[PDB]
Amino acid sequence: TNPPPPETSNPNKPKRQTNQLQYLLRVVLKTLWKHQFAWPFQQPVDAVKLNLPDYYKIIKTPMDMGTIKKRLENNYYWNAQECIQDFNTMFTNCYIYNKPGDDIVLMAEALEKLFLQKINELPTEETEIMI
Ligand SMILES: CN(C)C(=O)c1cc2cnc(Nc3ccc(-c4csc5c(=O)cc(N6CCOCC6)oc45)cc3)nc2n1C1CCCC1
């Protein structure tokens, strides 16, 4: 009833490390992880614990910062854009499922606003770093 967590490691997959991806782990996610509103996003949503029957009917691609952190540590992404998409998927799922003004929505918007501030300091070019 609770689907398995999303994939965090996969053999024979396009994988590498870039200066932008390192910045996503060492600076961006590091700042968002220690936010006061971060804990509801540090692990996948437990739909049966929170009594959300129609969650996985609406949300087709669940995503959370715990999964993103593991994917960054395991070098699961091919470039930075693949990781930023996972953040935007996480935010959008909360916007899709919940009414505007709800508590969990306000917390997600605060994280996204901070996320976009830390993203503006990303290096201009994406250069490949050895693993
Ligand atoms: C004032 N209260 C009740 C609190 O301080 C409080 C005590 C809590 C105990 N456990 C949790 N766990 C929790 C863990 C994950 C989520 C979550 C992540 S995405 C997402 C989402 O999209 C929708 C929901 N909902 C379930 C509750 O509200 C209706 C919509 O929850 C989530 C929500 C809650 N939150 C707790 N909270 C807050 C309320 C919800 C988030 C934090």
Author numbering: 43 to 173
Text of the article:
In this study, we describe the first in class rationally-designed triple activity inhibitor that concomitantly disrupts functions of three critical targets based upon known synthetic lethality relationships in cancer cells—CDK4/6, PI3K, and BRD4. SRX3177 showed nanomolar potency against PI3Kα, both bromodomains of BRD4 (BD1 and BD2), and CDK4/6. To gain insight into the molecular basis for inhibition of BRD4, we assessed binding of SRX3177 to BD1 and BD2 of BRD4 using NMR and X-ray crystallographic approaches. In conclusion, in this study we report the first triple action single-molecule inhibitor SRX3177, which disrupts cancer cell signaling through simultaneously inhibiting CDK4/6, PI3K, and BRD4.
To obtain the atomic-resolution mechanistic details, we co-crystallized BRD4 BD1 with SRX3177 and determined the crystal structure of the BD1-SRX3177 complex. The base of the SRX3177-binding pocket is lined with a well-defined water shell, which is conserved in other BRD4 BD1 complexes. Superimposition of the SRX3177-bound and H4K5acK8ac-bound BRD4 BD1 structures reveals that SRX3177 acts as an acetyllysine mimetic. Particularly, a hallmark contact, which is required for functional bromodomains, involves formation of the hydrogen bond between the acetyllysine substrate and the side chain of Asn140. In the BD1-SRX3177 complex, the side chain of Asn140 is hydrogen bonded to the thienopyrano group of SRX3177.
